[PDB]
Design a protein around this nucleic acid. Structure first.
Ligand SMILES: [Mg+2]
Ligand SMILES: [Mg+2]
Ligand SMILES: [Mg+2]
Ligand SMILES: [Mg+2]
Ligand SMILES: [Mg+2]
Ligand SMILES: [Mg+2]
Ligand SMILES: [Mg+2]
Ligand SMILES: [Mg+2]
Ligand SMILES: [Mg+2]
Ligand SMILES: [Mg+2]
Ligand SMILES: [Mg+2]
Ligand SMILES: [Mg+2]
Ligand SMILES: [Mg+2]
Ligand SMILES: [Mg+2]
Ligand SMILES: [Mg+2]
Ligand SMILES: [Mg+2]
Ligand SMILES: [Mg+2]
Ligand SMILES: [Mg+2]
Ligand SMILES: [Mg+2]
Ligand SMILES: [Mg+2]
Ligand SMILES: [Mg+2]
Ligand SMILES: [Mg+2]
Ligand SMILES: [Mg+2]
Ligand SMILES: [Mg+2]
Ligand SMILES: [Mg+2]
Ligand SMILES: [Mg+2]
Ligand SMILES: [Mg+2]
Ligand SMILES: [Mg+2]
Ligand SMILES: [Mg+2]
Ligand SMILES: [Mg+2]
Ligand SMILES: [Mg+2]
Ligand SMILES: [Mg+2]
Ligand SMILES: [Mg+2]
Ligand SMILES: [Mg+2]
Ligand SMILES: [Mg+2]
Ligand SMILES: [Mg+2]
Ligand SMILES: [Mg+2]
Ligand SMILES: [Mg+2]
Ligand SMILES: [Mg+2]
Ligand SMILES: [Mg+2]
Ligand SMILES: [Mg+2]
Ligand SMILES: [Mg+2]
Ligand SMILES: [Mg+2]
Ligand SMILES: [Mg+2]
Ligand SMILES: [Mg+2]
Ligand SMILES: [Mg+2]
Ligand SMILES: [Mg+2]
Ligand SMILES: [Mg+2]
Ligand SMILES: [Mg+2]
Ligand SMILES: [Mg+2]
Ligand SMILES: [Mg+2]
Ligand SMILES: [Mg+2]
Ligand SMILES: [Mg+2]
Ligand SMILES: [Mg+2]
Ligand SMILES: [Mg+2]
Ligand SMILES: [Mg+2]
Ligand SMILES: [Mg+2]
Ligand SMILES: [Mg+2]
Ligand SMILES: [Mg+2]
Ligand SMILES: [Mg+2]
Ligand SMILES: [Mg+2]
Ligand SMILES: [Mg+2]
Ligand SMILES: [Mg+2]
Ligand SMILES: [Mg+2]
Ligand SMILES: [Mg+2]
Ligand SMILES: [Mg+2]
Ligand SMILES: [Mg+2]
Ligand SMILES: [Mg+2]
Ligand SMILES: [Mg+2]
Ligand SMILES: [Mg+2]
Ligand SMILES: [Mg+2]
Ligand SMILES: [Mg+2]
Ligand SMILES: [Mg+2]
Ligand SMILES: [Mg+2]
Ligand SMILES: [Mg+2]
Ligand SMILES: [Mg+2]
Ligand SMILES: [Mg+2]
Ligand SMILES: [Mg+2]
Ligand SMILES: [Mg+2]
Ligand SMILES: [Mg+2]
Ligand SMILES: [Mg+2]
Ligand SMILES: [Mg+2]
Ligand SMILES: [Mg+2]
Ligand SMILES: [Mg+2]
Ligand SMILES: [Mg+2]
Ligand SMILES: [Mg+2]
Ligand SMILES: [Mg+2]
Ligand SMILES: [Mg+2]
Ligand SMILES: [Mg+2]
Ligand SMILES: [Mg+2]
Ligand SMILES: [Mg+2]
Ligand SMILES: [Mg+2]
Ligand SMILES: [Mg+2]
Ligand SMILES: [Mg+2]
Ligand SMILES: [Mg+2]
Ligand SMILES: [Mg+2]
Ligand SMILES: [Mg+2]
Ligand SMILES: [Mg+2]
Ligand SMILES: [Mg+2]
Ligand SMILES: [Mg+2]
Ligand SMILES: [Mg+2]
Ligand SMILES: [Mg+2]
Ligand SMILES: [Mg+2]
Ligand SMILES: [Mg+2]
Ligand SMILES: [Mg+2]
Ligand SMILES: [Mg+2]
Ligand SMILES: [Mg+2]
Ligand SMILES: [Mg+2]
Ligand SMILES: [Mg+2]
Ligand SMILES: [Mg+2]
Ligand SMILES: [Mg+2]
Ligand SMILES: [Mg+2]
Ligand SMILES: [Mg+2]
Ligand SMILES: [Mg+2]
Ligand SMILES: [Mg+2]
Ligand SMILES: [Mg+2]
Ligand SMILES: [Mg+2]
Ligand SMILES: [Mg+2]
Ligand SMILES: [Mg+2]
Ligand SMILES: [Mg+2]
Ligand SMILES: [Mg+2]
Ligand SMILES: [Mg+2]
Ligand SMILES: [Mg+2]
Ligand SMILES: [Mg+2]
Ligand SMILES: [Mg+2]
Ligand SMILES: [Mg+2]
Ligand SMILES: [Mg+2]
Ligand SMILES: [Mg+2]
Ligand SMILES: [Mg+2]
Ligand SMILES: [Mg+2]
Ligand SMILES: [Mg+2]
Ligand SMILES: [Mg+2]
Ligand SMILES: [Mg+2]
Ligand SMILES: [Mg+2]
Ligand SMILES: [Mg+2]
Ligand SMILES: [Mg+2]
Ligand SMILES: [Mg+2]
Ligand SMILES: [Mg+2]
Ligand SMILES: [Mg+2]
Ligand SMILES: [Mg+2]
Ligand SMILES: [Mg+2]
Ligand SMILES: [Mg+2]
Ligand SMILES: [Mg+2]
Ligand SMILES: [Mg+2]
Ligand SMILES: [Mg+2]
Ligand SMILES: [Mg+2]
Ligand SMILES: [Mg+2]
Ligand SMILES: [Mg+2]
Ligand SMILES: [Mg+2]
Ligand SMILES: [Mg+2]
Ligand SMILES: [Mg+2]
Ligand SMILES: [Mg+2]
Ligand SMILES: [Mg+2]
Ligand SMILES: [Mg+2]
Ligand SMILES: [Mg+2]
Ligand SMILES: [Mg+2]
Ligand SMILES: [Mg+2]
Ligand SMILES: [Mg+2]
Ligand SMILES: [Mg+2]
Ligand SMILES: [Mg+2]
Ligand SMILES: [Mg+2]
Ligand SMILES: [Mg+2]
Ligand SMILES: [Mg+2]
Ligand SMILES: [Mg+2]
Ligand SMILES: [Zn+2]
Lengths: 146, 119, 50, 126, 87
RNA sequence: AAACUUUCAACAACGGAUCUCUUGGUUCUCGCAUCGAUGAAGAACGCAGCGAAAUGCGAUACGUAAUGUGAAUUGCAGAAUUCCGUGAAUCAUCGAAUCUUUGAACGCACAUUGCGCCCCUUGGUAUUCCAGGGGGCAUGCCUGUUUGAGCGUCAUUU
RNA sequence: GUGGAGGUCAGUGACGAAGCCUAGACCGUAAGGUCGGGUCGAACGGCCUCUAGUGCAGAUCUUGGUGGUAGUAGCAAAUAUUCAAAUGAGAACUUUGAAGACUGAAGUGGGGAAAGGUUCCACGUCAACAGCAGUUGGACGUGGGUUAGUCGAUCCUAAGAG
RNA sequence: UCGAAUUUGGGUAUAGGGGCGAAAGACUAAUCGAACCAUCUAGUAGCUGGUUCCUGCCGAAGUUUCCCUCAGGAUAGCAGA
RNA sequence: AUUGGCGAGAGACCGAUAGCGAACAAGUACAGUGAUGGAAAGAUGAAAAGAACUUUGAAAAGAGAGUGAAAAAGUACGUGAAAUUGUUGAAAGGGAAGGGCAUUUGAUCAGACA
RNA sequence: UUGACCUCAAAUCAGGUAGGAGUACCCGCUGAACUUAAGCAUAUCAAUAAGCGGAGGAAAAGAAACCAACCGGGAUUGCCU
């Protein structure tokens, strides 16, 4: 089984592979199901906006550090500097990362100003009752693009 | 004809007990006939009636024993809910809603705030 | 055999009772479809294996 | 055009449902249309046939005949009009089996319930 | 002599009826059913015999109790009794 | 020339291709999470006015109670008091019951419808023997109750 | 040339679709196509495309069906039968009577263990079965039948099991 | 051969690279120089057999080289497009 | 994630030797000591209207009749191919038969004249 | 003599829990050979089948003794890569 001037191929089909074939027949299914799942979370979540606020972050390595990219959460430093606590910033749809450390001032001012603008562009309903219906903006990512 | 359930449910515990012996002599006699008569569908109704009295004599002595058990720890297993062998095991809402003293102070102090975006 | 257990004598009793032709009235029922008894057994043709 | 997600146009699913339908379901399947008169008389288009109704065969060979429904033969999906029958060779008589959709209802057999039904559909009555 | 003449001495059962599955697979001297493993607590079964597995799983039988767990669950395991309306 | 053999055709045989069917299968997708010592799954034997089976059920045995429907069931018989009604039905639904002999299967056995023990009760002139009725007695392990063992060991007696 | 799919011919059809038959007609080199008639009874075709579980003479091919063989091989071990009456549509074969024989108590007699499971018995009865027959049967149909303080089991122990 | 290393019933133990064998590779359920059952399994096969419509045009090789190669491959050659 | 379970919507899927082994009293009937193995089998008609009655027959049946739109649908039941068989009709045959080109004879048929 | 303590027992002691089923998917254990390598032992098949234990509606994994080497990222899982 070697003949002609053909490129040597490496078609790994010598285990019982036919046993482990995944046809994504449910691709349209699971998109319909994912859309409905979010339309329920939207409605469960009151006017709250489906996602949390994510920070700016410089991507690692010599290949992606040109770009800037949403990180996990806001570091204890940025949260404080932007004038609120970790414990509370979480209940206000702000993601906080106890693991991220601040070594670059530029990014730091960037995220602290990102927290200013977030606070200035939301409203936090009282604990009481009222619940002054105020209609959900759905993302937040979209609202405060990076 | 045939015996009716809501009509039995008014008779005394011992009227019903005698009704059964009335239907039993009744039945026992029909069976002596059924072997002379080519067919005797009468026997079906008299034997369903026995079943109906018995259900009543039993239904009554049961909701007797429920109530004189109702509202306490421990009552015969067969008056406890059936559900599922594993539903029976599941944690009761109480032992499930439990929260630690420390974490209670947390839910109170920083709870999920109802907020919205726009301005 | 000739001095059996009740379990065996019982199985034979239920056997006997299945060895009967079709009750002919069934042939008349609406949508009836059973023609003959297709599980008929005979002692000298198919042994019942206890 | 079906539109719900809980109707099935599946021709196999249907025929199974019809032939295996339980007695209680066949009662409504065996519906006859009321007669022209009776319809304006009751503000109602048709009704599950029942036994002591009065009917006129408006289809088939026994077109024109009429009579009382003798038995609803739900098992046979067929209703029997006592007055519409076959004689045989040996003189013997035998019901013809008739279908409520090819009959018309001319005089109802009225119950407490039969009326409340006619009113449940939005009718008036005499 | 290994064939027909010797078959005449076949008249002693190696197996009788298996209490747990009524199958005439109950070895007498071994005291154990070759089909279901009685009296071994677990019922005998193998992944190399998928027919014999099908030949016996739940639903090949009355399902005297399991029949109804579905309906009961469907109604949230109702304790009580239905009341009344009219008509 | 028949007979016979052969070939073609018509009509009749044999056989069940073909055509048309389809309450079945196969594959895809969506929704959902519920067996069991509160005895499961499985087995055995039974149960109808007339049933061998399939289905269903358990000595309350093709079913009992309940609820909805609103007049059937139907092969034959049948009841007839059930038709303006706490009411027909081999109906639907099902929340209440019954649920033999078994089965992880639990007093012991079980190629045996074999053999114990306790409690309440009934009859037989009977706490002790026999018989009928009811209710009981498996294993490991956890918490607790009670009763104990050991110079393991502390004190307290005169 | 076939099965299914998009489009189209507002295609064919219970006044007869599909199929099947037909040393009848016609078109094509051919694969095939068209028609007549007969049978039949509910569907079906042309053209442009799409699609594949798409074409059989073979594989000691798979399943089913059928021949020649052939009214043939054969139905010859176990000494043996015969006359009459009765029954019956029908009797070499049933029943009864008569005769001739056999097994010859190491039985072709009288009971049981194992195994069968109703074959036992009666009444009815011959479509299949009993490699001729059948009025007979261990067949078919419908019923009846198995009675225990002392016969067995149950109790005991054996090799052994556990 | 026929009074014993005799025949035989039932019960019981020995199980598959194992048993049992006064030893024949015998016997272990018509299976024995490794039982039966299912599965891995549609095992592999340089070998054998078969491989289904018509017409039209072109149309070969049994030679070279290397091969644990010699009933097979690769390579060139001849062939079509 | 999901060749199990409960409930649903589907398909350029199979169409009774196919599709699951099973569209049916199918994991049945049957085999085996056992583990296991495991079939075949759907379709009268709109409706039984499933053939009264007469006649021959011991009966089964045949022959009339009758039902039906049809018995060229008779519970052997839609259509009912082939191998193979009976009858009738035609024809040929001195150790096979069948085939090619050609024509006589017999049978049969298209078309074209006008 | 009397009362504790420690450790260990017994009850048809009071109340409970475990077994078995199923197993498509999930957590583990255990574990081949056919096969491929044109022979074959490493290798391959395959950390697969068969065997064993244990769960759920999912299981498991999961808030870094992590990735990195950057201007650093920031629980887990899954897809595209
Ligand atoms: Mg090359
Ligand atoms: Mg791969
Ligand atoms: Mg491989
Ligand atoms: Mg999938
Ligand atoms: Mg989805
Ligand atoms: Mg999101
Ligand atoms: Mg940075
Ligand atoms: Mg990067
Ligand atoms: Mg409020
Ligand atoms: Mg439970
Ligand atoms: Mg409890
Ligand atoms: Mg005996
Ligand atoms: Mg068997
Ligand atoms: Mg046996
Ligand atoms: Mg609607
Ligand atoms: Mg409706
Ligand atoms: Mg309506
Ligand atoms: Mg009916
Ligand atoms: Mg009709
Ligand atoms: Mg022999
Ligand atoms: Mg042998
Ligand atoms: Mg033995
Ligand atoms: Mg053992
Ligand atoms: Mg056990
Ligand atoms: Mg078990
Ligand atoms: Mg099981
Ligand atoms: Mg069960
Ligand atoms: Mg409930
Ligand atoms: Mg009402
Ligand atoms: Mg002459
Ligand atoms: Mg021909
Ligand atoms: Mg046929
Ligand atoms: Mg067909
Ligand atoms: Mg049709
Ligand atoms: Mg389908
Ligand atoms: Mg869907
Ligand atoms: Mg019965
Ligand atoms: Mg029934
Ligand atoms: Mg019920
Ligand atoms: Mg009845
Ligand atoms: Mg009444
Ligand atoms: Mg009511
Ligand atoms: Mg009711
Ligand atoms: Mg019902
Ligand atoms: Mg009871
Ligand atoms: Mg029950
Ligand atoms: Mg026990
Ligand atoms: Mg017992
Ligand atoms: Mg004993
Ligand atoms: Mg007393
Ligand atoms: Mg006394
Ligand atoms: Mg007792
Ligand atoms: Mg304790
Ligand atoms: Mg103590
Ligand atoms: Mg086509
Ligand atoms: Mg046809
Ligand atoms: Mg013809
Ligand atoms: Mg011709
Ligand atoms: Mg022509
Ligand atoms: Mg021609
Ligand atoms: Mg032409
Ligand atoms: Mg034609
Ligand atoms: Mg024609
Ligand atoms: Mg035609
Ligand atoms: Mg038709
Ligand atoms: Mg077309
Ligand atoms: Mg094309
Ligand atoms: Mg093919
Ligand atoms: Mg060919
Ligand atoms: Mg061909
Ligand atoms: Mg073919
Ligand atoms: Mg062929
Ligand atoms: Mg051939
Ligand atoms: Mg060929
Ligand atoms: Mg052939
Ligand atoms: Mg022949
Ligand atoms: Mg002859
Ligand atoms: Mg001869
Ligand atoms: Mg001879
Ligand atoms: Mg002789
Ligand atoms: Mg002599
Ligand atoms: Mg005479
Ligand atoms: Mg003779
Ligand atoms: Mg003489
Ligand atoms: Mg004599
Ligand atoms: Mg002599
Ligand atoms: Mg003698
Ligand atoms: Mg002698
Ligand atoms: Mg003798
Ligand atoms: Mg005797
Ligand atoms: Mg016998
Ligand atoms: Mg006798
Ligand atoms: Mg007799
Ligand atoms: Mg005869
Ligand atoms: Mg015989
Ligand atoms: Mg004979
Ligand atoms: Mg004869
Ligand atoms: Mg008999
Ligand atoms: Mg009898
Ligand atoms: Mg004795
Ligand atoms: Mg005893
Ligand atoms: Mg042991
Ligand atoms: Mg060895
Ligand atoms: Mg080996
Ligand atoms: Mg070994
Ligand atoms: Mg053999
Ligand atoms: Mg071996
Ligand atoms: Mg064997
Ligand atoms: Mg192959
Ligand atoms: Mg070679
Ligand atoms: Mg080879
Ligand atoms: Mg060519
Ligand atoms: Mg040339
Ligand atoms: Mg070399
Ligand atoms: Mg060499
Ligand atoms: Mg060769
Ligand atoms: Mg070269
Ligand atoms: Mg060239
Ligand atoms: Mg699925
Ligand atoms: Mg869909
Ligand atoms: Mg579906
Ligand atoms: Mg099939
Ligand atoms: Mg075929
Ligand atoms: Mg096909
Ligand atoms: Mg098959
Ligand atoms: Mg069907
Ligand atoms: Mg079936
Ligand atoms: Mg089996
Ligand atoms: Mg079977
Ligand atoms: Mg059969
Ligand atoms: Mg048909
Ligand atoms: Mg047919
Ligand atoms: Mg029809
Ligand atoms: Mg029909
Ligand atoms: Mg006449
Ligand atoms: Mg006449
Ligand atoms: Mg005739
Ligand atoms: Mg017509
Ligand atoms: Mg016709
Ligand atoms: Mg006729
Ligand atoms: Mg026809
Ligand atoms: Mg007939
Ligand atoms: Mg026909
Ligand atoms: Mg010659
Ligand atoms: Mg010529
Ligand atoms: Mg002219
Ligand atoms: Mg206790
Ligand atoms: Mg388990
Ligand atoms: Mg497992
Ligand atoms: Mg391994
Ligand atoms: Mg392989
Ligand atoms: Mg390799
Ligand atoms: Mg190799
Ligand atoms: Mg090789
Ligand atoms: Mg090798
Ligand atoms: Mg590999
Ligand atoms: Mg490895
Ligand atoms: Mg694999
Ligand atoms: Mg495995
Ligand atoms: Mg969960
Ligand atoms: Mg669960
Ligand atoms: Mg989820
Ligand atoms: Mg940490
Ligand atoms: Mg990460
Ligand atoms: Zn068993």
């Amino acid at each position: 089984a070697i003949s002609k001037n053909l490129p040597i191929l490496k078609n790994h089909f010598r285990k019982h592979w036919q046993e482990r074939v995944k046809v994504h027949f449910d691709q349209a299914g699971k998109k319909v199901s994912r859309r409905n799942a979010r339309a329920t979370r939207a409605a469960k979540i009151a006017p709250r906006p489906l996602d949390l606020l994510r920070p700016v972050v410089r991507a690692p390595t010599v290949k992606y550090n040109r770009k800037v990219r949403a990180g996990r959460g806001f570091t204890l430093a940025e949260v404080k500097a932007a004038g609120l606590t970790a414990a509370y910033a979480r209940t206000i749809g702000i993601a906080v990362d106890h693991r991220r450390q601040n070594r670059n001032q530029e990014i730091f001012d960037a995220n602290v100003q990102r927290l200013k603008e977030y606070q200035s562009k939301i409203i936090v309903f009282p604990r009481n009752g009222k619940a002054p219906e105020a209609e959900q903006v759905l993302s937040a990512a979209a609202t405060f693009p990076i | 004809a045939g015996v009716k359930a809501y009509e039995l449910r008014t008779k005394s515990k011992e009227q019903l007990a005698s009704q059964l012996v009335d239907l039993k002599k009744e039945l026992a006699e029909l069976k002596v006939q059924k072997l002379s008569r080519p067919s005797l569908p009468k026997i079906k109704t008299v034997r369903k009636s026995i079943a109906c009295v018995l259900t009543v004599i039993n239904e009554q002595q049961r909701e007797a024993v429920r109530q004189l058990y109702k509202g306490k720890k421990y009552q015969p297993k067969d008056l406890r809910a059936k559900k599922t062998r594993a539903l029976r095991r599941a944690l009761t809402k109480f032992e499930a809603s439990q929260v630690t003293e420390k974490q209670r102070k947390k839910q109170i102090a920083f709870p999920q705030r109802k907020y919205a975006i726009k301005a | 055999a000739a001095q059996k257990s009740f379990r065996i004598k019982q199985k034979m009793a239920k056997a006997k009772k299945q060895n009967r032709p079709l009750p002919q009235w069934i042939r008349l029922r609406t949508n009836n479809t059973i023609r003959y008894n297709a599980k008929r057994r005979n002692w000298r043709r198919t042994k019942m294996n206890i | 055009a079906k539109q719900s997600l809980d109707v099935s146009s599946d021709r196999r699913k249907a025929r199974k449902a019809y032939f295996t339908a339980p007695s209680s379901q066949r009662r409504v399947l065996l519906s006859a249309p009321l007669s022209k008169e009776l319809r304006a008389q009751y503000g109602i288009k048709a009704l599950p046939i029942r036994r002591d109704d009065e009917v006129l065969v408006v289809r088939g060979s026994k077109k024109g005949q009429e009579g009382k429904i003798s038995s609803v033969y739900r098992l046979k999906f067929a209703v029997q009009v006592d007055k519409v029958t076959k004689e045989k060779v040996n003189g013997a008589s035998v019901p013809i089996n008739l279908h409520p959709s090819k009959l018309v209802i001319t005089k109802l057999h009225l119950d407490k319930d039969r009326k409340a039904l006619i009113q449940r559909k939005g009718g008036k009555l005499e | 002599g290994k064939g027909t003449p010797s078959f005449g001495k076949r008249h002693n059962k190696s197996h009788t009826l298996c209490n747990r599955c009524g199958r005439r697979s109950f070895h007498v001297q071994k005291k154990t059913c070759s089909s279901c493993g009685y009296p071994a607590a677990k019922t005998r079964s193998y992944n190399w015999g998928a027919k014999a597995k099908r030949r016996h799983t739940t639903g090949t039988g009355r399902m005297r109790y399991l029949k109804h767990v579905s309906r009961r669950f469907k109604n949230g395991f109702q304790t009580g009794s239905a009341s009344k309306a009219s008509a």
